[PDB]
Amino acid sequence: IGFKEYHRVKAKKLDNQVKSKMKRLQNELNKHKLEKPNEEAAVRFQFDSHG
RNA sequence: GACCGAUAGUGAACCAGUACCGUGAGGGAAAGGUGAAAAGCACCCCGGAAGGGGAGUGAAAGAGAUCCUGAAACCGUGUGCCUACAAGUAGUCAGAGCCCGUUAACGGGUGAUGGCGUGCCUUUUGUAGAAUGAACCGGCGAGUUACGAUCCCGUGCAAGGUUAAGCAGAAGAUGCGGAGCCGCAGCGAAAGCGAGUCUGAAUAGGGCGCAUGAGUACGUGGUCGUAGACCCGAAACCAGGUGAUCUACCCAUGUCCAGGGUGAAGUUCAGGUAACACUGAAUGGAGGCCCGAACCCACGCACGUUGAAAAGUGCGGGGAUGAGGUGUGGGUAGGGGUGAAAUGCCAAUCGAACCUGGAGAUAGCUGGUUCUCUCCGAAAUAGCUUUAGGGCUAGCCUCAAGGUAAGAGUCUUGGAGGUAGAGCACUGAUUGGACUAGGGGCCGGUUACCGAAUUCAGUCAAACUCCGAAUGCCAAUGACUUAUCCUUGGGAGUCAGACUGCGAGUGAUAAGAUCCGUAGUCGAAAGGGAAACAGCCCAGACCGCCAGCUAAGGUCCCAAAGUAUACGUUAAGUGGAAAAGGAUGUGGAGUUGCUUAGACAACUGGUCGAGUGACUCUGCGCCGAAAAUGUACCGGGGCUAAACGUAUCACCGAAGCUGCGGACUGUUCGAACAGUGGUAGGAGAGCGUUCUAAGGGCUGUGAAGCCAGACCGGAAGGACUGGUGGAGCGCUUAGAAGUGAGAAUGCCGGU
RNA sequence: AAGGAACUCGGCAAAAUGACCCCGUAACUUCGGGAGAAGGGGUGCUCUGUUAGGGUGCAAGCCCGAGAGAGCCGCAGUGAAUAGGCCCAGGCGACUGUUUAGCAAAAACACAGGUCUCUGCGAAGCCGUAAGGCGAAGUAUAGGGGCUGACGCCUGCCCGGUGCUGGAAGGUUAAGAGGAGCGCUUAGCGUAAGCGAAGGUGCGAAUUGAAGCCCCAGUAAACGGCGGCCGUAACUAUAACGGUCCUAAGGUAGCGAAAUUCCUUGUCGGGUAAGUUCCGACCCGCACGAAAGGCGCAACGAUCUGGGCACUGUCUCAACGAGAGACUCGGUGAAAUUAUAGUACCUGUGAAGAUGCAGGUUACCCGCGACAGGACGGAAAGACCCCGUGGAGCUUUACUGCAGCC
RNA sequence: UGGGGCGGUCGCCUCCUAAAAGGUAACGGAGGCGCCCAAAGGUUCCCUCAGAAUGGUUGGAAAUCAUUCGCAGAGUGUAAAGGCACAAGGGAGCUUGACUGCGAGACCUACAAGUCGAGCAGGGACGAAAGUCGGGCUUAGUGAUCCGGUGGUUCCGCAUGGAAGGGCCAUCGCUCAACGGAUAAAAGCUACCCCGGGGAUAACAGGCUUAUCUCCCCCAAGAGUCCACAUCGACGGGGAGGUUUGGCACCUCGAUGUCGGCUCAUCGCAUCCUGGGGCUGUAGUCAGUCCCAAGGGUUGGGCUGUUCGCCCAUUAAAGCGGUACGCGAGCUGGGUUCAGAACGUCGUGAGACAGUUCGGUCCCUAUCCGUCGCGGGCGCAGGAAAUUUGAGAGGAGCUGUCCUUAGUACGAGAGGACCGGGAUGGACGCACCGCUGGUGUACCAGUUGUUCUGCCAAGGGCAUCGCUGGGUAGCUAUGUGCGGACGGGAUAAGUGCUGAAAGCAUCUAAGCAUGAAGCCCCCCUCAAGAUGAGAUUUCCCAUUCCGCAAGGAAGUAAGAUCCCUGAAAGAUGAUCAGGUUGAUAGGUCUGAGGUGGAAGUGUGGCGACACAUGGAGCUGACAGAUACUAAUCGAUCGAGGACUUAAC
RNA sequence: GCGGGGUGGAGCAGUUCGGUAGCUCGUCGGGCUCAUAACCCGAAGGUCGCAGGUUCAAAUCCUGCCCCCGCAA
Numbered sequence A: 001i002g003f004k005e006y007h008r009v010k011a012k013k014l015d016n017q018v019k020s021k022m023k024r025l026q027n028e029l030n031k032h033k034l035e036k037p038n039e040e041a042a043v044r045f046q047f048d049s050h051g
Numbered sequence B: 001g002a003c004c005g006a007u008a009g010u011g012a013a014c015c016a017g018u019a020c021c022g023u024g025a026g027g028g029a030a031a032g033g034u035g036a037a038a039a040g041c042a043c044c045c046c047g048g049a050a051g052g053g054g055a056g057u058g059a060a061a062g063a064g065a066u067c068c069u070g071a072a073a074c075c076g077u078g079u080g081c082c083u084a085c086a087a088g089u090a091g092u093c094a095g096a097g098c099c100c101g102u103u104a105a106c107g108g109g110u111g112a113u114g115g116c117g118u119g120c121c122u123u124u125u126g127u128a129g130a131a132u133g134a135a136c137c138g139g140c141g142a143g144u145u146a147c148g149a150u151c152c153c154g155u156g157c158a159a160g161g162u163u164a165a166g167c168a169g170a171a172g173a174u175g176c177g178g179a180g181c182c183g184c185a186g187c188g189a190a191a192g193c194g195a196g197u198c199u200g201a202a203u204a205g206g207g208c209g210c211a212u213g214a215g216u217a218c219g220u221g222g223u224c225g226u227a228g229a230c231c232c233g234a235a236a237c238c239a240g241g242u243g244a245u246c247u248a249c250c251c252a253u254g255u256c257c258a259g260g261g262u263g264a265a266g267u268u269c270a271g272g273u274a275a276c277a278c279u280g281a282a283u284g285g286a287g288g289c290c291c292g293a294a295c296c297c298a299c300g301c302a303c304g305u306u307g308a309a310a311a312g313u314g315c316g317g318g319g320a321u322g323a324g325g326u327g328u329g330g331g332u333a334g335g336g337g338u339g340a341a342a343u344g345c346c347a348a349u350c351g352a353a354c355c356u357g358g359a360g361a362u363a364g365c366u367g368g369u370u371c372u373c374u375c376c377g378a379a380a381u382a383g384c385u386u387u388a389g390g391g392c393u394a395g396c397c398u399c400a401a402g403g404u405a406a407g408a409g410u411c412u413u414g415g416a417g418g419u420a421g422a423g424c425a426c427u428g429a430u431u432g433g434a435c436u437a438g439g440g441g442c443c444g445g446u447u448a449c450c451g452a453a454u455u456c457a458g459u460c461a462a463a464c465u466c467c468g469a470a471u472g473c474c475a476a477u478g479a480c481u482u483a484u485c486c487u488u489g490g491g492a493g494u495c496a497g498a499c500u501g502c503g504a505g506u507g508a509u510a511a512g513a514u515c516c517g518u519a520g521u522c523g524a525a526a527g528g529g530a531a532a533c534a535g536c537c538c539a540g541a542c543c544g545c546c547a548g549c550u551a552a553g554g555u556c557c558c559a560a561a562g563u564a565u566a567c568g569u570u571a572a573g574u575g576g577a578a579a580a581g582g583a584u585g586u587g588g589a590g591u592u593g594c595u596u597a598g599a600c601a602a603c604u605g606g607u608c609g610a611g612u613g614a615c616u617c618u619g620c621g622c623c624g625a626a627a628a629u630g631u632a633c634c635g636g637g638g639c640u641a642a643a644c645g646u647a648u649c650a651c652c653g654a655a656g657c658u659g660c661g662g663a664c665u666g667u668u669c670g671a672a673c674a675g676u677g678g679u680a681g682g683a684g685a686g687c688g689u690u691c692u693a694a695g696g697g698c699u700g701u702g703a704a705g706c707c708a709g710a711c712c713g714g715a716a717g718g719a720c721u722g723g724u725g726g727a728g729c730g731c732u733u734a735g736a737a738g739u740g741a742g743a744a745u746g747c748c749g750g751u
Numbered sequence C: 001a002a003g004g005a006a007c008u009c010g011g012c013a014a015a016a017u018g019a020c021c022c023c024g025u026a027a028c029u030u031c032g033g034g035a036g037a038a039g040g041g042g043u044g045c046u047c048u049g050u051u052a053g054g055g056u057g058c059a060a061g062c063c064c065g066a067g068a069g070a071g072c073c074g075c076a077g078u079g080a081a082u083a084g085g086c087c088c089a090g091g092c093g094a095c096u097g098u099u100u101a102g103c104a105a106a107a108a109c110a111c112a113g114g115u116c117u118c119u120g121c122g123a124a125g126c127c128g129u130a131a132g133g134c135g136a137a138g139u140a141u142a143g144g145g146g147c148u149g150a151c152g153c154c155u156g157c158c159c160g161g162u163g164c165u166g167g168a169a170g171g172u173u174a175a176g177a178g179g180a181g182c183g184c185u186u187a188g189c190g191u192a193a194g195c196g197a198a199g200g201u202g203c204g205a206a207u208u209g210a211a212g213c214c215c216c217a218g219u220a221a222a223c224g225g226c227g228g229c230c231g232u233a234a235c236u237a238u239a240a241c242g243g244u245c246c247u248a249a250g251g252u253a254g255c256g257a258a259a260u261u262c263c264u265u266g267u268c269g270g271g272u273a274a275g276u277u278c279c280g281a282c283c284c285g286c287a288c289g290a291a292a293g294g295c296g297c298a299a300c301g302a303u304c305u306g307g308g309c310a311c312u313g314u315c316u317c318a319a320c321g322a323g324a325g326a327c328u329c330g331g332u333g334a335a336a337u338u339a340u341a342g343u344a345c346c347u348g349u350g351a352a353g354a355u356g357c358a359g360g361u362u363a364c365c366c367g368c369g370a371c372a373g374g375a376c377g378g379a380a381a382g383a384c385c386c387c388g389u390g391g392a393g394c395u396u397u398a399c400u401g402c403a404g405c406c
Numbered sequence D: 001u002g003g004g005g006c007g008g009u010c011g012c013c014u015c016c017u018a019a020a021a022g023g024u025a026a027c028g029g030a031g032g033c034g035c036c037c038a039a040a041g042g043u044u045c046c047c048u049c050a051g052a053a054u055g056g057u058u059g060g061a062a063a064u065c066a067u068u069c070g071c072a073g074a075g076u077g078u079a080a081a082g083g084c085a086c087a088a089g090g091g092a093g094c095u096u097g098a099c100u101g102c103g104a105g106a107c108c109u110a111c112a113a114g115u116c117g118a119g120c121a122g123g124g125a126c127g128a129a130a131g132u133c134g135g136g137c138u139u140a141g142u143g144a145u146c147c148g149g150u151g152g153u154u155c156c157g158c159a160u161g162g163a164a165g166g167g168c169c170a171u172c173g174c175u176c177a178a179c180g181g182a183u184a185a186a187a188g189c190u191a192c193c194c195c196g197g198g199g200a201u202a203a204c205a206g207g208c209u210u211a212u213c214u215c216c217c218c219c220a221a222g223a224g225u226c227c228a229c230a231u232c233g234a235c236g237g238g239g240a241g242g243u244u245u246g247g248c249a250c251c252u253c254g255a256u257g258u259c260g261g262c263u264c265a266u267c268g269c270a271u272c273c274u275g276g277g278g279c280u281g282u283a284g285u286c287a288g289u290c291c292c293a294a295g296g297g298u299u300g301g302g303c304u305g306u307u308c309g310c311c312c313a314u315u316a317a318a319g320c321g322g323u324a325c326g327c328g329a330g331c332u333g334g335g336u337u338c339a340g341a342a343c344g345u346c347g348u349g350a351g352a353c354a355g356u357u358c359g360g361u362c363c364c365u366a367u368c369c370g371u372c373g374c375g376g377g378c379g380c381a382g383g384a385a386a387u388u389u390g391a392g393a394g395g396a397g398c399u400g401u402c403c404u405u406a407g408u409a410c411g412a413g414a415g416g417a418c419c420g421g422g423a424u425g426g427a428c429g430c431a432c433c434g435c436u437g438g439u440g441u442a443c444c445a446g447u448u449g450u451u452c453u454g455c456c457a458a459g460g461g462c463a464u465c466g467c468u469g470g471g472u473a474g475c476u477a478u479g480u481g482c483g484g485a486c487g488g489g490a491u492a493a494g495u496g497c498u499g500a501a502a503g504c505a506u507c508u509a510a511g512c513a514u515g516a517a518g519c520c521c522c523c524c525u526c527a528a529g530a531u532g533a534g535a536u537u538u539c540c541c542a543u544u545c546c547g548c549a550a551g552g553a554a555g556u557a558a559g560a561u562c563c564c565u566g567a568a569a570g571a572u573g574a575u576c577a578g579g580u581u582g583a584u585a586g587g588u589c590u591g592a593g594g595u596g597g598a599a600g601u602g603u604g605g606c607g608a609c610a611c612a613u614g615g616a617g618c619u620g621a622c623a624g625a626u627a628c629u630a631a632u633c634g635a636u637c638g639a640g641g642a643c644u645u646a647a648c
Numbered sequence E: 001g002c003g004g005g006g007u008g009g010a011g012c013a014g015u016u017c018g019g020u021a022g023c024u025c026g027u028c029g030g031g032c033u034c035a036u037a038a039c040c041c042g043a044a045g046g047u048c049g050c051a052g053g054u055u056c057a058a059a060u061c062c063u064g065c066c067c068c069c070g071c072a073a
Ligand SMILES: [K+]
Pocket: none
């Protein structure tokens, strides 16, 4: 009696860890989320050589 | 004093802040009554005494010291009826026999036997429930009060109504007191304007108002707000204190450890060396050393487990000169201390001690909430919700006041719509044939090699439609019938629903499953049937009757009524449990092959001598058919009808309906008609308890209380008589409430 | 009796061992131990005997006292009571010690030893608001804190992240200093519109202004971390070797199916007739690893684990006996529980598991000694699960704060 | 929220579910939206689309033309539905009505909101005019309040004038997307845990269902040398059971204790063994499959907590299930899920498991029914003492090996029977103590320590009965004897005989047999409360009172009890042997069995000790005898026999 | 069913935000050497897994389809 409930209670604890990790990560990003630094564009043009 | 009267009122009426409980702060009871007067039972008898039986005192001793009254539980004694073949929610209805004789009544007690019948409460869709609560009896124990708001009702005055504090006065009535409050005027955010005003450019429209008018003061009642706010109940939080006489650690000063063993360093001697080293003996007496009592500890097992003991005993076990045991006196205190660290320990309490206070913390949760009858009578739904077992608005109920006839049923007529069915005209899916562009595999020419598209026929669709109902829905006009309906306001409860039939989804076209639509019953519905069986069938209990007719369902016995009538079927106890499938079971229709030119069968083409084969539909049966305590799907007996089908007629059968009698409610005009189940809940009318006022009484020639009884009223309830009791108590009208108990693992007492 | 662990989760419990003397005693070792290892033998009484010898004493005489020989008795001589069972092997902890008073004594805590770090003395650290204290009447060979835990051999790589330490300029930043300016107000100017001094007043920018942070180095017995893919050797198979990607760096020694191995009762060897346990190896380490230390390890342990011997009522399989209860009599006399009970069985029905309902079956009335199938028995308003916009303890880069510190 | 969690969802639009008005749920089936357009809006005017065939330079299936056919097969910004070809689809001219104030009246609706709207006024666009225009073919494209920003303003301005500040109108700021929005501001652990509730809600067992599971079938492609159906049974189809995995959430949260084991069983049959049969690809021995059959039986160990499973060794066999996965007020407590601790792993962490490991309190005196035993009462038409019948109930029910038949039948051999006789075991049961043993606490003996009887000798107490060696009665198994034997009756499956219906055939319809360890008996035990109270033999005898009777009372008869001595009986009652003309118990005497040579004395020895007297002495329960002691005297209870009929 | 990958021969970027297809090694050809390696000089090798859309332009954005790898299975 209560076999699966016991094991499923354990499962629910693992879920709570995921939810907490998620929530904290989201909150941390909102507090401090550096944007990716500018990737300077590269001008490219070549005077193709003639014969 | 419309305050209490010994469980009340102070905790304390009494030698009570006592007894008792706690180390302490602190907590904290129980317990009143002789008589007018002790006149408190001289004397005698039984007894060791207690306790009795007389005799005396007294109005009374059945007033004799827990001494007014003396209920119930509970415990006994005697006996009028019944009881040892009986299956019991304990009664109720019927009923002999026996025994009595009353509030004199179509009486009382008991009860062989027959019928019927699973407590009360709470909580539930649903409880006899094996869900909850109560051992029993008694007492106590829960919507109250203050101040505001609003509505109804009553009264006074009325376009007005009314005073508050305060001052005089019986703690009163009343007089004075007009400040203030509400209303008569509204509109606008406001300036402001005013029967109008605001918006707007507007004499427009529209909103809110006016014309269509009643308020106010006080009282009663309903509800609401703020207060503990109907009563009981947390785990907790915070504040101030009390604890280290237990236990943790520390500090100071004491004290305890029977006996035995092992033999460290060092030292000495002897040997040894050039010297040392080295070797052997002896001495020596180290150690969180060894073995083992006291003492301390607590490893295993048994026992104990309403214990001898709220942690022990018995048999073994570990340490036992050490980081040892223990005494005395001290220290550290809870947002703290102490911890060789277990969240362990800090007075049998520790993830935050104990006591008191804030405090009646809060509890959308559980439990409880006390007299009676009558009128009406739900909901378990929608929306929103840090919402889902809560709440709010609507729906559904009730009361009152208005409108009033505006409601409803049916018929007739009109209309909106795309479901069932059907259909392929579109969109998808799809079968066969034809015709086929191409596509691939073969040498640009072909394969029956994939094949687009076209066409012919043929299927199919919740999210296909050229079509398209039945019902249901919205209206209109009459007619016939019925009595509802709407507006405003007061009060609610309900938001867990259940099953059954039908139409669907989810599921597996399972579920007493789940979610909607629709109708019913239950919930909140007793009675009859289905053996028992909320939801199925029949049918709605105001009450009495030893009257009648019926419904579902029945009629051989249990058990009321047909062993009814007529015609067939079944042989399986089918009826009284299930499929695919199998089968010369049997009944009834129909078709067809052959047949006295002689069949089928059997006999060596003939003998023989009247039937013989196949198939379709259909009624009732058969096999397929094995579960666990015990026949075990007919309720039982039992049944060959007492089963099944068809038809007919009788009778039985409810609390349905009818007849007779009574009560009440409503409607219309004392009559008639109609109605009278009920949970949550609304409304009305009453009974009873305590106290007050005013009248009128009762009571020592016996009050209240208590105990009986066969009386009275529709209920709550009220009398009368007798016994006990020994001094208070009813009745009528009105008023005010500590006003009604069977349940709260309620509190206290008794048993 | 016979058997002897066949019992059982497990030799739990009991049995067996036990004193003194003599002989004898292994692996291993930290050279002390292990060790009472283990395994054996002896034990009574009598006579040689106030013994050989020893203590006391002036001596007599008192005590102590081995060893033998020679005999006697019994089933048996520490004749009773009291007094280790032992051996082999492994895991963990070194050890003695300490711990959940009252379900855990242990591998947990402590420990000596190791290391890191703080502290120059009014030390750091700690208690307190402060004074005043502990530290300490101490002074870096001392004191506090963290981690590890005797001893032996060792303790590898990574400073990118986080912490700590040290820097130097610079960037960012508060109060406080500064008050450019702007608004309001109004003497006055004006036909008005509007402008507007001074004063007052409401805002106020530049500039200035520390630590911290940013930045740069170091530090791992600081908190921590310690990888993927591809190819390659003349049988094959594996790769000493090579390529590339990523990282701060990719796990070294040692150990390994483990207190760690899910698959798994891995495979192999040993032990048994039979071994999911055990021991020895192997290494595809789900998910070892070097001071939350790695690997060994004598001694120690009421530690955990497996195997032998002894021994037995643990068992095959139960029997008998003793005492105390039970039972009868005399005395005394509770408790939990309890809606009232004249309180059967079967099948069924029902809130789906009935003493109580239905249909049958069975049953004369009342007890006593016994057993526990039922009364969903008693006890404790379930601790599991879910719910409540309940509580408390704890954690942190949750939110908001406070002390402390700079 | 078909427990919670994860996943998914949360507001709005379209369709289907939705049952032809509207509305209508589920974590039902499909999709879209959080915009876009300055023209893709308004108006005025004009206008048809897709596709196919044919003709044509590049040109190709498909670009552009041209003709014919061609209801929409197109398009309509953006999903779907409803519309649209007097277009809402395409093109062109001018413009901004994608206006301001509004708004009769309606739809929808709990509210808050949302939707439609003629018409009026102001000032405009297009148009010759009528007239149309308050965005788009229609239906999504959005967010309350509070609080801030901005613009306007015949509003207010706290003595007054200003101002500060506010109001009104317009407008902006929320993926407040959990979209009717808790605060401006918020994550976890609890195994150290606690409270209030719920069977409204998880689970076990129960109930319903039966997808799955187990078992059984239908069809028959086939496999099987041929041959579907000896055996096996593809592709499909139909059931039963309620042991499995599930679905549901109906009972239980003011408690229905768990897996495994132990003790004790009980039931079903889907039969593991034994019994009886059909078919066989059954020669014999063996087997295969199916039918009947539930009477009895159905092992001991190693490993593991285990169930299970593997293994070892047996057995005739090592059956499958139900009983709350039977059985914890019957036991155990090893596994698992309390508090401690540790490893691996995860986490910053408290801690946790996707894994392990060592240690960890099992309470209750039985009221009722039930079950096993034992009594008392009454009844059974007189009162007693014995012996009995059997309605009915319980018990028992198993089986191996060997010898013989017979090396026969059978077979090429190998091997090797049926049936019928006979012996002897295993397990199990009943009884009993003569035998073998156990026990034997009032028996006998040996012996240690100490204390006592004054000492010696001889003994007593205590030390587990001090210990040790024996042992009577009784009680006992492991010991012994015996049992399940012979068979009858009726049947099951099966085998048939005669025999029609249906000139044949046929076990069947009438009729007649056979045939199982099973059923009813036989065998053992209880049994007349069998209220239906039975039957037989024997004994006692009609009393005395009252009362009119019915009936009542009092002494007794036969007989029994109280009381007493006891055991062959026993918890107590009861039962049985006895109670003085009695051997009932004790004692006494004589024995048995048991122990094993007493004490005293003498002799031998220095002594411990040995020997003789002497199979001695001692001896609980056992046997026989014997009144020596106790069973005294007494008391109590116990019939006089109802009525009716029939036959005598 | 739920996720991750397919870029010259190997290992890897670039993909979100469209703009010449790349880095390291390797392969091939020619030198150097007696010859091989190293070294030096040139070149080839992917139209970004496949097939269609969108766009002036797609490895990159969209639609389908096929492989590889993890789990569950
Ligand atoms: K009183």
